[PDB]
Structures are given as C-alpha cells and as structure tokens.
Structure 1
Amino acid sequence: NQPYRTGFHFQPPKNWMNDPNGPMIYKGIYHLFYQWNPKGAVWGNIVWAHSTSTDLINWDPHPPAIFPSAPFDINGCWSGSATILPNGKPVILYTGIDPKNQQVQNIAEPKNLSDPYLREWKKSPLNPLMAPDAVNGINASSFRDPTTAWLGQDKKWRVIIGSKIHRRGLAITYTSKDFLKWEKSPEPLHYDDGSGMWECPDFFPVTRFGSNGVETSSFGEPNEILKHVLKISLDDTKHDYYTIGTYDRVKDKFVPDNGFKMDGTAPRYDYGKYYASKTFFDSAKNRRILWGWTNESSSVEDDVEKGWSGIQTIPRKIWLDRSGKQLIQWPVREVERLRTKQVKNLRNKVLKSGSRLEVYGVTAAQADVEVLFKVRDLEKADVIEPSWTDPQLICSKMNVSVKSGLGPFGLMVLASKNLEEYTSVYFRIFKARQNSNKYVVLMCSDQSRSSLKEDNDKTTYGAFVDINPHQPLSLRALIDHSVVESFGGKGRACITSRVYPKLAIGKSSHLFAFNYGYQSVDVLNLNAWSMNSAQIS
C-alpha cells in the first residue's frame, strides 16, 4: 500500500514536510517542530507542526504550534530556532511572511510553561522584532531563518539571519539587551561573494578534542579550546555546507580557518540528499544534535499520488574530529534500541573478485548494518588521476561494473533477489601518487539501478573519506524502505539517499556484501540487525 513510507524515520502521517524547526530540550522532553503543508503533498501554506519525544526516536503528535494568526505572519510561518534563556525559559524566533509578502522576524513563547509538551504558543504584540526597511536596506525577499541566539560576554544577545545582496550570501547579525529590542549590526558575522542566498544559517561552538556538545553561549576557558562552526544551506546547489573557524568576539565576526571558504567548495555534513539542517544542545546527555531534511527523489506525481513528501534523517550527535579538519556525525544512540534482539553476524569471510555474499535472516528493507573491511594488498591500488577532484563525478563515471585494484567493495542494499534493482554503498581505494604510501578512500552511494521506474531521481553520490586504509574500513547503513543513510569511517563521510524500488519491498528486499575489485577483500565483521518500527507522529 505505502511501500516507501519509513518504519523508524520521522515523518508526518501525510502531506509535505521540509525544514526542521526549533529543535530543543525542555523539562527533559525533546521538541521537533517542522515546516508542514496542512493540505497538500507539495510546499505551500507552510506552518510549524509539532511533535515531542523523550528518546529522539518515538514521537507524539501535537496541534500546529505556530501558524498565521496576525499581520506579521499572516502569509506564512517560515523557519526558525529555539533559544533557551538563562532562566530556563524557551523562546522561538521565526520568519513570518507579512501582509506585503515581505520576510520578517517574529518571536513566540510558551502560553503555559508548566505544560511540558508546550502545545500552545503566544506571540508578542511588538512583532516583527526585526524587519527590512529603507534604513537597513535589507532585501525583503531574502531575509529569513533566525538561529538560536547566544549571550555574549557583554550581556548583549546575538542572533543571525540568512540573507543575500546580489550574488553575495550574508549572515546578518542583530544584537539585543532584553531579547525584545533588536538592533542591526553594521557588519555581518560573515559573508561570501558568489555563493547566493544563505538559507538556514547555524552558528555553534565545539570543543577541540572530545565528542561532547558545548552550550551555545559557552566560552573557551584558559584550559578549554573551542572552535566555532558556521553552517549555511545554499539556494544555489541545494546542499548544506560548514566551515570550522574562530569567533572573533571583539569584531563579532567569524574567521574560517586557513583553507576554508564559506561557499560551495566547503565541506558538507552529508554528501547526498540533505538540506535545511539545524543543531541544538541536548543538555540532558551533553551533546550537540543535528536535524536534517531529506526531500523525495520520486516524481511530484508520485508524491501527490502517495499523499506525502519529505522525511527527516535520523538525528545525529556531532562533534569535532581529532584532526580538527572536519566534523564527525553519528546517529544518536537511542536509535539502537530499535535493533532486534537477534543480530545476524558474519566474520572472517573472503570476498574474492566478482563475488557477493548475501546476509540472511534480517528484515532487509528495515535494518541497521555495520561492517568492517580489511584490504590485504594496499600497494596493488591504482594511482588516482590528479585531475579527479570531485568525488561525486568519479562515482558517476566509474560505476560498480568498472573494476579497480581495490574496489568496488561494500554493500548492496534494498536489492531484489536477482539484482534487477539494488543500491550500492561502496569503497574504492586509490594511491594518492605514484609509489606513494598515502592513499585516497572514495565512498559512493550509487542508486543508478535502485528502481525499475525511470521517473525517480537516480543521481549517484560520492565523498572522500579521511581514514587510513592500513586499518580496517568501517561502514554503517541505516535502511528504511525508501531511505538509506550511509556512514563511512565511523562518521567521517555521510551519504543519505532516497530510492523507490518496484521489486525490493518488504520481504522481497535483500542485503548483500560484495566485491567487484581485482584484489580480494576480507569482511572482518558484519553485523546486520533487523529494525523494529518506531511509534512516530
């Protein structure tokens, strides 16, 4: 009936969803709001829907939290963020579409703070708190998505809003003493020429060595070393980008570390289908947690026909990696509670050239699988072409039927029994240079043969992974009917994808480990769990 609806990913009962909104924790209860069209399978009439959780996995529905109810948001309630004030009170800053269809920034706060589920929200008669006008000269059609606010050393709040001027992307900074009167700062927190619109900006601290989250307003003590992360979703490319840098508190400006530029050349959280992502600080278990919207890769006709569009990926804890060159992401550990009690284990199998090994006894369309690969002869790896710089484009031209020294090896997920349909999540290993000991690990999510229906967007994804192939290669896949979430190298490379198979559904989907490279690769360990369904809104 609905073979592509997910078993444990967040999505509403029906209709269009996009950006996650105002993720927060309050009185030990997680809140996710999200952009939702109450009466269609495409974007429009957008309101904030609302669901609550105590584990980030099972979700209880609530009435729409924020919807048009006043001039300043009469034409729509667009994206925004929750800030937890020092006294413990949550407030929401969000973009409203006003009566002249200009984008403006409004505040909402709880109607009853004793209500843990914060079902009803009221809005200030002073709204909008921040808006375009003749003096600031901000572009009224490119001025949205307020961040969580952070309290500076001088007791004045900061908040940034995504914007642009011509081809230049902006993170417009506003400051405030009381959180009601906001004043525009002359210079923005950062900008970039040529990037285009900066949608859904995020700005947060991270500790230099460690995996715990840092409270957004937390300072770097004469012991503690914090970097800051600026994230932007770019209109232009439909992807999410981040740079690692320092936060000049004197200038109130963000300086990306040498090598970083905040545009399309920057690194991504996810190298597949992933947009409008937003973090929040989970004070209950000390971790920053990242929400991400994954839209459909089916046709709009298929969307309208099935009656829904859009999912959230599984929430992932994030932190700075040891080297400080990238962020590491990993699905929140609560997702592991869905894992069936009886794991399927393979250990010490040799996938010779051209082989595949099927993994039996698992609900293959709804599963979590972790695998370790060990290559024996690294020196047999092919020298990468120095002009091959774009990992996605490599995966596109070198498909799984094209052999190399090391790889393709990995998983074939959501596969039919006779492999009429399959999604390949695999590795290739290249030698960085001739006679070198440095190696390049490529990760591909190939969905060229994921479905017999051609209407589906069957674009392939790629990403290089900063891991030493001398050590075993890690690979985790969350599988859920129409979504595959892949994590290379224990979270250093993430690729979310959407697939819609005709044969590989429910009991008729299968799971294979495989190797089509010239050399043989070992599978040190392969754990495949069936995943139970979550109770979701």
Structure 2
Amino acid sequence: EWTREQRYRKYKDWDAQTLLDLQAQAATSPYQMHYHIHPLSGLLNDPNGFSYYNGEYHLFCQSYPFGPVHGVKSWIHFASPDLVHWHYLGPAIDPDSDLDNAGAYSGSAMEHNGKLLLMYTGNHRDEDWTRIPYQVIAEMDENNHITKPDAAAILPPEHVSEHFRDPQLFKHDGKYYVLLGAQDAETKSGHIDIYESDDLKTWHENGYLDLGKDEMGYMIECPNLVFVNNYPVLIFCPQGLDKAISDYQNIYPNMYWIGKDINLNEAKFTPLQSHPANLDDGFDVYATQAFNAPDGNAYAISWVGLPDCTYPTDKENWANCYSQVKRLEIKDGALYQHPVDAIKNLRHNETQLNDEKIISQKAGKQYELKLYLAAGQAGKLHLASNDDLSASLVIDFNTAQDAKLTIDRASSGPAVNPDYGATRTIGLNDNEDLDLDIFVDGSLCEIFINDGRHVATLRFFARSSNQKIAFDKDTKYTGRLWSMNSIL
C-alpha cells in the first residue's frame, strides 16, 4: 500500500515528531526483542560491515526508519565488546549523494592502516529511474566518523544486469578481493563475481566464481567467503534457486557451501559438499553476513525477516530483527552454528529439569531452554502456550524409528507468510538422543539442534499471556531453563 514516491521520499522530508513517535512505538511493542538487535524505528534488514575494529566488534544494519517497508536505505551502526551487549552509534551512511541517491545498499568492512573501510553498493537511480549499481569504498575513523568519496571503486561491467551488489572486501594471500552478487545480463543467472586489487585503487574483474554447471538462481544476494577450521565456506542468498538442487521452504533461501579449496585468482571453487545446504532450517533467516575475527573464530549474524514478505507487526510501523551471533565450525563435512559464550552472561533464575511434563506454567518472554531428550520417544514440546496447549509454538519430535523434528507455528498466533507453510521439518538420525538449545525473545525463537548441527529461526506472535512450556506426554529428558535479561 506504500507507493514508490512514499518509500523514496528523502529523510529530510519527514518531520522529527513522526520519527520520535515511531521510536516509541517500536521500542514499546509487546512483540519487541530485548536481547537481540532490533530497529530503533521502522525496518531493519541485512547486516552490514560486521567486523572487529579499534578494540571492539562493529555491526551495521540496512535501515529504513519511517515504517515497516523497504524505503530508501541507510546504514546504522552498533558496537559491542562481546557480540552480545550492543550499543547504538546512530546512522552511518545515508542515501545523500549521486552514487547512493536511491539507497546505501549492503556491504562489508575491512580494517586498513588504522581505519575501517566500508565497501557498499550505491543504489543510483538516474533521470529515468534506471538503476545503476556502484561499488563505493567509504572510510571510518577511530571516533566512528565516516567519509565517503565522490567516485565509485567499481563501475558495472557490460555483461551484468542492474543486479550487481553486496560487496565483500577482504585481504587474502597479500592481495585484496571483492566478492559481489551478480546477475548475468544474457542468461539472467546468479553468480558471485570476483574482483582483485593490489592497492585498493585499481580493480581487475577475475570473473564469476565457478560453482559448477547448475544455475544458482537468477541472482545471488549477500555473498560471503569465510574460512572456518581452514575450509573456505560460501554463505549466500540464491534467489530463484531450483529446489532440485536443495529443498527449502522460505520464499528465497540462505545457503552455505563448504569447499575443500578456493582459488580467487582463477575463480575456482572445489566443493567438499556435492550440493549447497540451507544455513537455517526455520522460517525467517536471510542475508547472513560472516567474517573472520582476530581471535581466530568465524562469526555470522542473520537478518530475521524475508524480502517480499509481510508480518503481523507491520501495523505497529516497525519490522524485523537480527539473530544472535553464531560462531561457525566445520564438523563431519557440515556447518555447525553455536551461540557465543558471552550470551550465557544474560542467564538468571536457573531451574533444573528432570522428566517434568510441565516445565513452566508461565516462563516470561525472554528465556533459554536447553534439553537433552532420550532416544526412542515421540511427542510434542509446546512453547509460548496457552493452558490447554491449543495455541503454542510446537516442536514435534521423534527420536525413534522415523526420527525428525517438525516446528509448527500455525496455532502460535496470527498467520505469518502462510503461502510458504506453517511447518519446517529437520530430519534426525533414527534411535538417537536429541539436544535442543532454544532461545525465546519477544516474537523471536532460535532453536539450536544437536549442538548446532541445525538451527531453526522464526518469528511468532503469541498473546502476551501465552507463556506456558510443556510436553504433551510424559517424556524422559534432562535440562535447564534460564530467564534472559533485557539489554536492548
């Protein structure tokens, strides 16, 4: 219902009273998250510039502050000591120049000679509203102040369409590389385009990374290369991916692909996995960004929200949030994702659990529930439930002969993008034990399965009084329930 004209009106054409009212409405929503990054107002999308710089972790965010829609985008900035306690540093990059006149689109951050380079796509729209994507390298100093150049680092080559964006800038084997999401103009196929530079001034196009003969959709958004336990891992968003390659149920998937080896000079990838896999088996994860931190870990964080989708909170004039930070690991040829050790510092009021059918009559809105469930069982765990278990988030489990987890949000509250289904299923090994580490925060749930072998992340909109946690049947398990303190 918001027209193009309304979405692209400049921030200076909105009044400040409207913005202050929107900040109040977002912060005081009964569906707001209070230990995950969320918008101060309006809509949040893709994580950007995820980095370590000047003694702390940095994270930037795609932002449209005036409503629950993809209006003209800016970067906002947060920092933290520990990947958990974030503090807001305000807007960072505005759509205020010719290069970015219709948005400061997504990008990355790389430390260089005591500064943090912020490489992003300028979403230019010309006199005729034709999109011309520019790749821009801005610079942030040790006081978090940003300067932007007058000229693009990379102009769009003739062989890509208008879709050519989301640069990842990094240093590898003494050279600089940029990975970009690209649509080939002739085939309309999705690719990761590689550029290289010795000096950050002149860029050479090495060409599309060779990901085999099968198409990766019609566009790749938010490509990332991170090294995890010495393996090159791609994390990327192939819009229109053929489900023959990999099943997924969300409108657009967020995949990962582990390589044995990558050669960015020759645009070669040697796959470890025969096929890419879903990063997240849940309902709402997109635009994951990852980076290699100086502690020797690779960290990722996800937009919880999908393009071209709607949510029940739209009428409250704000949208979406982030996942918690995930530390990455490769084990047994698969990507594992772990909560960072600092998130334990939010825990309070520990309860020990042993075989209790009702875990809590009323658990509050922010908790962590960690369970060890025996093999050979079937049943349902209800979270954010009413008393009679008819309205809840359901985790339907079987650890017996047809083992699997089905997460069902149909009865949890109002419908959420129901054209893409109200259930998500994760196969499990027959007759094996099951670990769950479940984080609830307002209208966000993150389920870490079998110590991070799988992660299911989703929005859900339960009535405020629906806080019960219970199994439907007597279940053999041990675990702990903690409240999680508000920090945001």
The TM-score normalised by the length of structure 2 is 0.84
Listed one character per residue, the Cα deviations across residues 475-512 of structure 1 (whole Å, up to 9, x for unaligned) are 1110112111111101111111111123xx1x541111
Structure 1 residue 194: deviation in Å?
5.4
Structure 1 residue 13: deviation in Å?
2.0
The 5 Å alignment of 1:460-499 reads 460-465=423-428, 469-470=431-432, 472-499=433-460
Structure 1 residue 419: deviation in Å?
2.2
Structure 1 residue 430: deviation in Å?
5.4
Aligned partner of 1:522: which letter?
K
1:218 alignment counterpart: none
Contact 2:197 2:203 in 1 (8 A): yes
The whole-number CA distance in structure 2 between the counterparts of 1:90 and 1:149 is 11
2:204 alignment counterpart: 183
1:312 to 318, 322, 326: 322
Contact 1:363 1:531 in 2 (8 A): no
Which range is displaced more, 232-241 or 361-370? 361-370
Listed one character per residue, the Cα deviations across residues 145-203 of structure 1 (whole Å, up to 9, x for unaligned) are 11132323xx3322110012234211101010111211111453546425221100011
Listed one character per residue, the Cα deviations across residues 406-426 of structure 1 (whole Å, up to 9, x for unaligned) are 4234x2111112223101123
1:326 to 331, 334, 337: 334
The whole-number CA distance in structure 2 between the counterparts of 1:305 and 1:512 is 31
1:41 alignment counterpart: 68
2:123 to 94, 97, 111: 97
Task: Confirm whether residue 10 of structure 1 aligns to residue 34 of structure 2.
Answer: no
- Structure 1's 187 and 16: CA in aligned 2 closer, same or farther, altered over 3 A? closer
2:343 alignment counterpart: 335
Aligned partner of 2:97: which letter?
A
- Structure 1's 148 and 246: CA in aligned 2 closer, same or farther, altered over 3 A? farther
Q: Percent identity?
A: 25
Listed one character per residue, the Cα deviations across residues 278-326 of structure 1 (whole Å, up to 9, x for unaligned) are 112232x4321111011279984843421210100111111111x1x21
- Structure 1's 280 and 254: CA in aligned 2 closer, same or farther, altered over 3 A? same
1:510 alignment counterpart: 468
The whole-number CA distance in structure 1 between the counterparts of 2:403 and 2:114 is 45
Contact 1:456 1:500 in 2 (8 A): no
Aligned partner of 1:281: which letter?
N
CA RMSD of aligned residues (A): 2.4
Listed one character per residue, the Cα deviations across residues 215-265 of structure 1 (whole Å, up to 9, x for unaligned) are xxxxxxxxxxx22111211222412101111334363411212x5234xxx
The whole-number CA distance in structure 2 between the counterparts of 1:456 and 1:186 is 37
2:406 to 444, 447, 470: 444
- Structure 1's 186 and 447: CA in aligned 2 closer, same or farther, altered over 3 A? closer
The whole-number CA distance in structure 2 between the counterparts of 1:255 and 1:456 is 36
Contact 1:272 1:494 in 2 (8 A): no
Contact 1:278 1:292 in 2 (8 A): yes
Aligned partner of 2:137: which letter?
I
- Structure 1's 360 and 38: CA in aligned 2 closer, same or farther, altered over 3 A? closer
Contact 2:166 2:180 in 1 (8 A): yes
Contact 2:99 2:152 in 1 (8 A): yes
2:379 alignment counterpart: 408
Structure 1 residue 463: deviation in Å?
1.6
Listed one character per residue, the Cα deviations across residues 29-76 of structure 1 (whole Å, up to 9, x for unaligned) are 111100000222111111101112112222222231011232111221
Structure 1 residue 528: deviation in Å?
0.5
1:421 alignment counterpart: 391
The whole-number CA distance in structure 1 between the counterparts of 2:353 and 2:307 is 33
1:292 to 280, 283, 302: 302
Aligned partner of 2:117: which letter?
V
1:522 to 458, 476, 481: 476
The whole-number CA distance in structure 1 between the counterparts of 2:189 and 2:417 is 33
Which range is displaced more, 453-462 or 45-54? 453-462
The 5 Å alignment of 1:138-537 reads 138-139=160-161, 141-152=162-173, 155-165=174-184, 166-188=187-209, 190=211, 192-193=214-215, 195-207=217-229, 226-236=230-240, 237-249=251-263, 251-257=266-272, 259-262=273-276, 266-283=277-294, 285-295=295-305, 300=310, 302-321=312-331, 323=332, 325-340=333-348, 342-347=349-354, 349=355, 357-360=357-360, 363-375=363-375, 378=376, 406-409=377-380, 411-429=381-399, 431=401, 441-451=403-413, 453-454=414-415, 457=418, 459-465=422-428, 469-470=431-432, 472-502=433-463, 505=464, 508-515=466-473, 521-523=475-477, 525-534=478-487, 536=488
- Structure 1's 84 and 426: CA in aligned 2 closer, same or farther, altered over 3 A? farther
- Structure 1's 344 and 182: CA in aligned 2 closer, same or farther, altered over 3 A? same
The whole-number CA distance in structure 2 between the counterparts of 1:161 and 1:298 is 22
1:389 alignment counterpart: none
- Structure 1's 56 and 176: CA in aligned 2 closer, same or farther, altered over 3 A? same
Local SS of the residue matching 2:40: coil
2:136 alignment counterpart: 106
- Structure 1's 247 and 88: CA in aligned 2 closer, same or farther, altered over 3 A? farther
Contact 2:311 2:416 in 1 (8 A): no
Local SS of the residue matching 1:231: strand
**Alignment: residue pair count:** 441
Listed one character per residue, the Cα deviations across residues 388-440 of structure 1 (whole Å, up to 9, x for unaligned) are xxxxxxxxxxxxxxxxxx4234x211111222310112322454xxxxxxxx6
* Structure 1 unaligned spans of 5+: 208-225, 351-356, 379-405, 432-439
Task: Confirm whether residue 78 of structure 1 aligns to residue 96 of structure 2.
Answer: no
The whole-number CA distance in structure 2 between the counterparts of 1:309 and 1:412 is 26
Structure 1 residue 144: deviation in Å?
0.6
The TM-score normalised by the length of structure 1 is 0.77
The whole-number CA distance in structure 1 between the counterparts of 2:423 and 2:311 is 22
- Structure having the larger proportion of residues in strand: 2
The whole-number CA distance in structure 1 between the counterparts of 2:283 and 2:30 is 22
Contact 2:311 2:417 in 1 (8 A): no
